[PDB]
Amino acid sequence: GSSGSSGFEPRSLITSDKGFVTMTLESLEEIQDVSCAWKELNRKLSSNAVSQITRMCLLKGNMGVCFDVPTTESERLQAEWHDSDWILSVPA
């Protein structure tokens, strides 16, 4: 409802073991199901690259998605993201 911004400034962990990385995609409003996100991603990413997306789940609030990708494709994904209203981030 009406609270202070949820983002905050949490403590930075000692990054070391570069294994996998998680991604987030914020929506404008609610969506139908993951099909919305998948259809969009398929129109903004290549079949080859989009296949790296795993564990795509609906965020708590249906206002975006959360998924995992390799640390290599993570930068390509970030650069290839354009021409869409959705915001792309990579949290801790």
UniProtKB/Swiss-Prot annotation:
Highest expression in skeletal muscle, liver, heart, placenta, and kidney. It comes from Homo sapiens. Interacts with C1QBP. Interacts with the ubiquitin ligase CTLH complex through GID4. Interacts with TICAM1. It comes from the Eukaryota. Belongs to the DEAD box helicase family. DDX21/DDX50 subfamily. This is ATP-dependent RNA helicase DDX50. ATP-dependent RNA helicase that may play a role in various aspects of RNA metabolism including pre-mRNA splicing or ribosomal RNA production. Also acts as a viral restriction factor and promotes the activation of the NF-kappa-B and IRF3 signaling pathways following its stimulation with viral RNA or infection with RNA and DNA viruses. For instance, decreases vaccinia virus, herpes simplex virus, Zika virus or dengue virus replication during the early stage of infection. It is found in: Nucleus, Nucleolus; Cytoplasm.
